[PDB]
Design an enzyme around this catalytic site. Structure first.
Site, mmCIF file in Angstrom:
data_model
loop_
_atom_site.group_PDB
_atom_site.id
_atom_site.type_symbol
_atom_site.label_atom_id
_atom_site.label_comp_id
_atom_site.label_asym_id
_atom_site.label_seq_id
_atom_site.Cartn_x
_atom_site.Cartn_y
_atom_site.Cartn_z
ATOM 1 N N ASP B 73 0.772 -1.212 -0.023
ATOM 2 C CA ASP B 73 -0.073 0.096 -0.032
ATOM 3 C C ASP B 73 0.692 1.330 -0.024
ATOM 4 O OD1 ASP B 73 -2.173 -2.137 0.593
ATOM 5 O OD2 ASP B 73 -1.552 -1.755 2.604
ATOM 6 N N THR B 221 -12.773 -2.245 18.142
ATOM 7 C CA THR B 221 -14.434 -2.741 18.141
ATOM 8 C C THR B 221 -14.813 -3.057 16.540
ATOM 9 O OG1 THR B 221 -16.677 -2.027 18.516
ATOM 10 C CG2 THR B 221 -15.215 -0.239 17.701
ATOM 11 N N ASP B 248 -18.876 -2.383 10.610
ATOM 12 C CA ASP B 248 -17.455 -2.901 10.080
ATOM 13 C C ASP B 248 -17.390 -4.502 9.768
ATOM 14 O OD1 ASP B 248 -14.694 -1.937 10.031
ATOM 15 O OD2 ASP B 248 -14.558 -1.939 12.049
ATOM 16 N N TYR B 333 -13.494 -1.362 -0.041
ATOM 17 C CA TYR B 333 -13.803 -0.089 0.362
ATOM 18 C C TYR B 333 -15.085 0.646 -0.195
ATOM 19 C CZ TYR B 333 -9.310 0.475 2.804
ATOM 20 O OH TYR B 333 -8.380 0.498 3.735
HETATM 21 C C1 RA2 Z 1 -2.315 1.457 8.055
HETATM 22 C C2 RA2 Z 1 -3.571 1.808 8.156
HETATM 23 C C3 RA2 Z 1 -4.597 1.034 7.202
HETATM 24 C C4 RA2 Z 1 -6.046 1.104 7.920
HETATM 25 C C5 RA2 Z 1 -6.469 0.976 9.309
HETATM 26 N N1 RA2 Z 1 -4.423 1.627 6.142
HETATM 27 C C6 RA2 Z 1 -4.741 0.947 4.805
HETATM 28 C C7 RA2 Z 1 -5.599 -0.598 4.992
HETATM 29 C C8 RA2 Z 1 -5.649 -1.069 3.635
HETATM 30 C C9 RA2 Z 1 -6.465 -2.477 3.699
HETATM 31 O O1 RA2 Z 1 -7.078 -2.649 5.025
HETATM 32 O O2 RA2 Z 1 -6.908 -3.107 2.810
HETATM 33 C C10 RA2 Z 1 -5.367 -0.695 2.452
HETATM 34 C C11 RA2 Z 1 -4.596 0.629 2.445
HETATM 35 C C12 RA2 Z 1 -4.228 1.104 3.529
HETATM 36 N N2 RA2 Z 1 -3.634 2.508 3.628
HETATM 37 C C13 RA2 Z 1 -2.020 2.451 4.061
HETATM 38 O O3 RA2 Z 1 -1.529 1.513 4.277
HETATM 39 C C14 RA2 Z 1 -1.605 3.957 3.680
HETATM 40 C C15 RA2 Z 1 -2.942 4.651 4.029
HETATM 41 C C16 RA2 Z 1 -4.029 3.767 3.522
HETATM 42 C C17 RA2 Z 1 -3.937 4.116 1.767
HETATM 43 O O4 RA2 Z 1 -3.650 3.100 1.008
HETATM 44 C C18 RA2 Z 1 -5.616 4.037 3.878
HETATM 45 O O5 RA2 Z 1 -5.587 4.085 5.235
HETATM 46 CA CA CA Z 2 -12.923 -2.629 13.457
#
Ligand code: RA2
Ligand code: CA
Ligand code: RA2
Ligand code: RA2
Ligand code: RA2
Ligand code: NAG
Ligand code: NAG
Ligand code: NAG
Ligand code: NAG
Ligand code: CA
Ligand code: CA
Ligand code: CA
Ligand code: CA
Ligand code: CA
Ligand code: CA
Ligand code: CA
Lengths: 390, 390, 390, 390
Positions: B73, B221, B248, B333
């Site tokens: 990511d 949670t 969630d 998402y």
């Molecule tokens: C580390 C935090 C986490 C969310 C709890 N973030 C995250 C989760 C997923 C996923 O769970 O699939 C995919 C991408 C991200 N992202 C990152 O790693 C950098 C920011 C971004 C953008 O890609 C969005 O928060």
């Molecule tokens: Ca949660």
């Protein structure tokens, strides 16, 4: 507030000529580098400043790996797309307006109205989009494939009318008319007269008061149901075309349907959408129709004209006006549209030329254009130049 | 000076319907001739005249030779790109706005504000761009992946608000809010109430005074932290959603979290960004939420609604409103956005449909759209039609 | 008459950050479906409403069959092309402005001025284009490769200035300055002071009265000839940069050039174009420079700053400001440009990152961007992510 | 009502220089990913704000599977297309205006007029399109390939003139002139004087009263029929060019045609369209002509000039002005056009460079551009850099 569109007087002229041809698959060779969308049911609608070329893509391209299914007419992938008339409708060039397996559109002089139909066959639904915003819907009343025209809806002084239908292809299909304004249905019209089966209506303004349509009856007659819609009283009546020059396909020899105007004749199960456009003169009215050549198949396409008279009660055969497509080329859906010049309107006739190669390959179509320009007689026909083996 | 954007009354309607689907990989066959960008975290934001489709590309395309890494990511290659909603986001069609591995954007009625986040995990930084000019930044306060919403920021009368967060995914992540005007941060807001872990907030205007957000708590949670932000006093408070219909994923059976509104329940480590949009009526307030079908995985997606009430203290389960995606399709998402019609706003819900095929191939996503139009009930679901073997 | 462009006060800020990266060859895989142009000597120039990305294409693309020759710098095929900054410069996306193997351009606030240089080495010629019309030329005065800046020319109140040079790369190359207005050379300026060898000047407005340039001496010193040009008296003088932080490449250890400001030191045959941009404050002047990391090769690139003082007589080393590119990545030509925000100007530094893989393959370049935004310190470096084997 | 276009004074200058080259097939490698259209008979026409590059495509691209037939000049597939001058004319970038195997176009200052010719050889027809609307036609009067110029028609104060011809290539071909206004033929002009064979006329404004043309006689003389057309009396007369510098191809050694101006000399069956443009000064008139190098083949192309005098009765050889193309490169149709600067007009000369590789492969062409800019002498020639084996 860019004033509303209104039907004008057609531009001076007395014959149709080959205008433009959009053959996107002339670029889909396996050895080429283009990505022309796989579509069907194309049509054109024009605004004050531009004409757009619409169609129903199967969300796939040539060459691609999703050819299977491009033969079916309904699914959750089909979308209404469009490009400026003159541009090849490719993956990159196209704009996907909304998901739909049946559609229409028209420009009220200010914004574009896009109509699309999708959902389950038993409860399909009509979606209306005005520019960028989705603004209204309409539900299936006969619960059997709610479908629309597959050609430009018509607007006047701000109000746009659109024919919708619901029912069995080989049974009852009483059509209805929607009066849309700024994206929302402000009225529902129930047709009068012969309403057994009416669909895929090609409509246009015969005048500021009447919108006429040549339609398709799919299970009873080779004759074409003809709609007349009064814009002032917002009422509409239907009656079969009386001419002996049957416009549907399949059909029997001309004038072979015995009886009076209203007689259906043999069923001739099936049909096809036909072109139809008006030639408004000061004190005369030209009515142009197109119809395939082969009496039983979708090959070739000829132009026909008939000035004045009541299509509902005139049996005199139509005046042949030319061969737009030879019986050696495919001639499927034809539609009519009008280009807006500086002071007058220019009637045209589109011709979907389907590249049917079977069920084990892709299935798409070119679009051939013929418009009113000059005098004399239609001089040249149209070919697709496409080879389905490349 | 094109007046500033302000939240309006939603357009009349009472249900959501399949609107549009952008499946760029329906064109990435090894045998095709297209170049659809490999992306993730897509979303839509609209201005008075157009809606743009944003995403975070891995700076590679399909078919390509840079698939390895598209699963991660964060990296120095990821970029925020966007295209007019309706155009396939391809190499040629896209506009690269700025490098970032986390972003957001919104239109204040005059210009676009683009937000992007990149840099090292321990000291990442938020970059703000107003139109063409880079105009401001913001530093990591918790030094642990400064990240943002992944959805449209919200503007009003010229002031735009944006939620940012900093902290461990499985720990403390106190979010903050930025008040941006003409490209520069003019204020920093510190939330009140339950602030242990809050992120990926989907925000929108509940009214001219309040901006509400449904967010993601990733380590405590299955309930969704819900933000309420007063625009007049520029203060913001957070509290967990009280409904038994946990939004969630993963999560346990509905209503299974014993205790009062505030109880966290089992950790259910992890989560997901969820859709959320408002339906502002004259004297009522519709709140639409989306959530995957599978309680533990990202498959399927259903729509939920609930008019009026205080999400902070109402445990009555939400009203199921339809299946936007079946549990046989991927549902990742989801976000909310609003299209601007002539006199009212039209709420919509986007759905990122990821084509996860493992770690040894490409990883991209389609975007499915559902908006408020008409009445009745959601009629049809969405599929991607994409085969990852082509 | 859209008022003429004038230098403004820079926008508030105190550091540079990774902004945008255009790596077109991330899409030129033999297995991909894109056609990114093969170019070199890229640069950016901005107008009131948009920034354009220019370069000198070898009129070929990747993958293609015309790689041989892309290594040479001059021929009858090279052309000046450009795209909106943010768009990948591909065959379809690009606009070919004029044939040239050396160029520059700038926007006077009304129209674009394009400068291109082509013809035989012994009598090359400078062509000026204003918008669509070719309007003037300039002949080689030293009959030895008439060449220009390879970066944005600068305009003020309607008058645009441009540095041109003529002469041996390893000998005398007295540069000159052209004062262009509405497309035609209205004046020729002959520099004063150290004029032995001056070229590839990166110029910018230090104020409404002075235009300064950091240039390249290719055969005598590792120091950078620094031009100061008075816009009011239209006279220009040159002197070598006195800082011990030699900006050229190759070069010896900093401060190792014994003697006073003016001493050349060892020849260090060769050089490179360097970035340089201004940070105009109310009562202070920031001068940003870039220079490769390796003292002898084009690898890596660091940012340097120095507020106030006279570069002509200040030997105090420059203040290191960050690593824009690591010595593991290629760092070739760097240039400066300014984005125009609503009320102030935003200085930036471009970095051509050449994909040199030898003489038996293609030779192109990415463009990395860093602009003034916020405070703190440069946080992240740039990579191309391109593999020349694909 | 954007005022009508009128011929202006040419911009100051005294020589031509290599301006721009559009070599689309530099991108059609079998191993590349581009789709450049296969065309012929290209030309440029400019409006107040932009110049467009027109041509007659064979509705196929390179690489493709429809190369067979690209050698023929007439068929039901050929179309008139165009792109902004500077853009590579590819499948996606191009706009198909109308079907035609012979065409022309010009901008009256308000809208574009497109002329196309198609139909059967024995009864072909001229179609006129004004912007979006098809508005008029013209029939074959000699029933033997009604054809037009293959270069910009000329407009003045709203009235546009266009030369059309009908007749045998090796016989009588009395040309005619059409006076078009707002899309419709408002007058037909019959030329006087030597009218045996006249065609492919390159016309331009010598002044506000006279439109002059250099044309092609295909079966009687190597001399070029020269038309003079009075715009005030709308009458036109033709006479052969008296210069000993024969512009046609093939042709015999200069001055070898014995007799007075009017003598035809040996037939020299065949010919070629030649470039021709005016240089209007306050009290002088420059007349620029182009002609291939080889006396018998289409190789190379040189520029010629001659100020003042009556081409009808001046035998003094023309003043050689430079080698635009070497006899090692192909030089086919050349045409003239004018770019519109802020206060004056800029004359240019286009050069179709055909990639003829035989009858068993594709057949397309690049377009080389040379315009009036500066003083001195034409410095550089043009090459296509295209290899027909890729
Ligand atoms: C580390 C935090 C986490 C969310 C709890 N973030 C995250 C989760 C997923 C996923 O769970 O699939 C995919 C991408 C991200 N992202 C990152 O790693 C950098 C920011 C971004 C953008 O890609 C969005 O928060
Ligand atoms: Ca949660
Ligand atoms: C079921 C009714 C029938 C016409 C009598 N419709 C129809 C016929 C053909 C054809 O005969 O080739 C192709 C497509 C359709 N369409 C559908 O199946 C859905 C609506 C649409 C659009 O594709 C047009 O009516
Ligand atoms: C001969 C002078 C030399 C600089 C000292 N020029 C030069 C150097 C390099 C390089 O050192 O890599 C690359 C290109 C050029 N250029 C040319 O050869 C023609 C003009 C241009 C444009 O390509 C820029 O000066
Ligand atoms: C038959 C008359 C002849 C010129 C004397 N025309 C002609 C010659 C050539 C050529 O000599 O290479 C190429 C194309 C044509 N054209 C045609 O055959 C139709 C009209 C057009 C357009 O292609 C131009 O005249
Ligand atoms: C076919 C026809 O006559 N249409 C009329 C048009 O002439 C008139 O200008 C306009 C005014 O609304 O109404 C419409
Ligand atoms: C949800 C809501 O009522 N929003 C209001 C809108 O009605 C009003 O026109 C505007 C004036 O600024 O402020 C906002
Ligand atoms: C660096 C600088 O001060 N530039 C000035 C700007 O402030 C002023 O508005 C303008 C008026 O022409 O001239 C320029
Ligand atoms: C070649 C020439 O002189 N053309 C004239 C131009 O000078 C004048 O401004 C215009 C007015 O219509 O008419 C044209
Ligand atoms: Ca494309
Ligand atoms: Ca029937
Ligand atoms: Ca493209
Ligand atoms: Ca393209
Ligand atoms: Ca040096
Ligand atoms: Ca394309
Ligand atoms: Ca001849």
């Amino acid at each position: 507030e860019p004033e509303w569109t209104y039907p004008r007087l057609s531009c001076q002229g007395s014959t149709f000529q080959k205008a433009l041809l959009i053959s996107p698959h002339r670029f889909g060779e396996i050895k080429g580098n283009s990505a022309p969308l796989i579509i069907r049911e194309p049509f054109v609608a024009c605004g004050p400043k531009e004409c757009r070329h619409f169609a129903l893509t199967h969300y796939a391209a040539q060459p691609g790996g999703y050819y299977n299914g491009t033969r079916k007419d309904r699914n959750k992938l089909r979308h209404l797309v469009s490009v400026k008339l003159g541009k090849i409708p490719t993956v990159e060039n196209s704009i996907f307006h909304m998901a739909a397996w049946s559609g229409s559109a028209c420009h009220d002089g200010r914004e574009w109205t896009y109509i699309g139909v999708d959902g389950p066959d038993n409860d399909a639904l009509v979606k209306i989009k005005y520019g960028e915003a989705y603004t209204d819907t309409y539900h299936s009343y006969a619960h059997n494939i709610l479908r629309t025209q597959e050609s430009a809806c018509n607007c006047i002084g701000g109000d746009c009318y659109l024919m919708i239908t619901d029912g069995s292809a080989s049974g009852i299909s009483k059509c209805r008319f929607l009066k849309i304004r700024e994206g929302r249905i402000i009225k529902e019209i129930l047709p009068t007269g012969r309403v057994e089966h009416t669909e895929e209506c090609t409509c246009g303004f015969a005048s500021n008061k009447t919108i006429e349509c040549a339609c398709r009856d799919n299970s009873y007659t080779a004759k074409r149901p003809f709609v007349k819609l009064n814009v002032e009283t917002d009422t509409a009546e239907i009656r079969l075309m009386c001419t002996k020059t049957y416009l549907d396909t399949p059909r029997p020899d001309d004038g072979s349907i015995a009886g009076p105007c209203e007689s259906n004749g043999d069923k001739w199960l099936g049909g096809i959408k036909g072109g139809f456009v008006h030639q408004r003169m000061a004190s005369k009215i030209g009515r142009w129709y197109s119809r395939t050549m082969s009496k039983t198949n979708r090959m070739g396409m000829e132009l026909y004209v008939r000035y004045d008279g009541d299509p509902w009660t005139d049996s005199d055969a139509l005046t042949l006006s030319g061969v737009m497509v030879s019986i050696e080329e495919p001639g499927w859906y034809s539609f009519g549209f009008e280009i807006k010049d500086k002071k007058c309107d220019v009637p045209c006739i589109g011709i979907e030329m389907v590249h049917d190669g079977g069920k084990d390959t892709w299935h798409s179509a070119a679009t051939a254009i013929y418009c009113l320009m000059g005098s004399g007689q239609l001089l040249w026909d149209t070919v697709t130049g496409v080879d389905m083996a490349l």
